[PDB]
Amino acid sequence: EAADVERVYAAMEEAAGLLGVACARDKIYPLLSTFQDTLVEGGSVVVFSMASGRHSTELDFSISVPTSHGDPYATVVEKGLFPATGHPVDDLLADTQKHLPVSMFAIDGEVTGGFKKTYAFFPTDNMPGVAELSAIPSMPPAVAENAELFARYGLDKVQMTSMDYKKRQVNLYFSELSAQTLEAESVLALVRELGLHVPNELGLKFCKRSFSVYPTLNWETGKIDRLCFAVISNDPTLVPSSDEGDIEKFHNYATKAPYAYVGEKRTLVYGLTLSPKEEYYKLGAYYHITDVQRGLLKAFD
Numbered sequence: 001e002a003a004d005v006e007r008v009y010a011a012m013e014e015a016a017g018l019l020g021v022a023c024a025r026d027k028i029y030p031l032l033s034t035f036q037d038t039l040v041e042g043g044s045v046v047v048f049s050m051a052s053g054r055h056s057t058e059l060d061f062s063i064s065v066p067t068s069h070g071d072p073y074a075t076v077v078e079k080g081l082f083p084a085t086g087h088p089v090d091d092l093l094a095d096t097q098k099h100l101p102v103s104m105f106a107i108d109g110e111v112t113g114g115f116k117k118t119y120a121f122f123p124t125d126n127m128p129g130v131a132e133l134s135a136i137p138s139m140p141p142a143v144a145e146n147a148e149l150f151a152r153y154g155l156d157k158v159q160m161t162s163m164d165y166k167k168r169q170v171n172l173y174f175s176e177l178s179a180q181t182l183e184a185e186s187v188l189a190l191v192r193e194l195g196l197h198v199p200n201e202l203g204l205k206f207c208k209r210s211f212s213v214y215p216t217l218n219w220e221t222g223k224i225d226r227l228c229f230a231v232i233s234n235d236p237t238l239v240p241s242s243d244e245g246d247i248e249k250f251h252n253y254a255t256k257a258p259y260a261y262v263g264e265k266r267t268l269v270y271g272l273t274l275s276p277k278e279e280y281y282k283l284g285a286y287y288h289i290t291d292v293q294r295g296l297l298k299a300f301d
């Protein structure tokens, strides 16, 4: 409703404020208004995320959208909020719902740049494997071409995918991760084969605690762009960095980010991203949570 739109935008401004980032109202309000029906507390998931290093001047936001509301990408294009890219990514969200059971969607953007991404969630008890995903016509060929590698490291079931319309990239969020997969030996071998930044002791300890792992792929080459390990927790001190600046800044955000569910501790999702040239950190502070997050905390925190 109107009040919800205002409440969520005010929260977004508060979160961005902690990072010294200013929101572009003209790029955000129309989007929130368009999806105002999803902003009611309960059943909704909203996350405001910060990052380290060269990615620190931006605040990302992600808002869940029920499938009943319809393809959110189709919505933003038809309403004139975003231009079709003319590339296969334009058809991926639709093709995913066509070929696989999608249980929920999500829209995502940057507070200074606006809408730029969608997510497709799959049922936890009926998740697709790399084979099913590689069959989708508009999926990057890189998914099928890295199938042998994924299998070798136990990256099988995918809980959700995300599509970045501006960068023309796809993330595969692997779940039901085996202990073996997250053991140091496995992680090091994987990063080695992908030619990504080698994590140290602190980084590997963080990887072992992960509940989700996601590589980023593209349509131009079969090479994986980067790999991210995610950790969910109520502990505000987990950023896997030795930098005093990061330690202080992430803890500050973790203990001051806005949240509507007072009476419970803030739900936090940390990320450790490994690219060919470096490693960086992310922290998503949930403004809205559901029982999915409560269950994850009991299982992983």
Ligand SMILES: O=S(=O)(O)CCCNC(CO)(CO)CO
Pocket (backbone or CB within 6 Å): 050, 051, 055, 058, 060, 225, 226, 275, 282
């Ligand atoms: O490989 S990179 O680090 O250049 C691209 C990833 C940056 N993405 C954010 C959003 O998902 C935004 O700045 C993450 O922090």
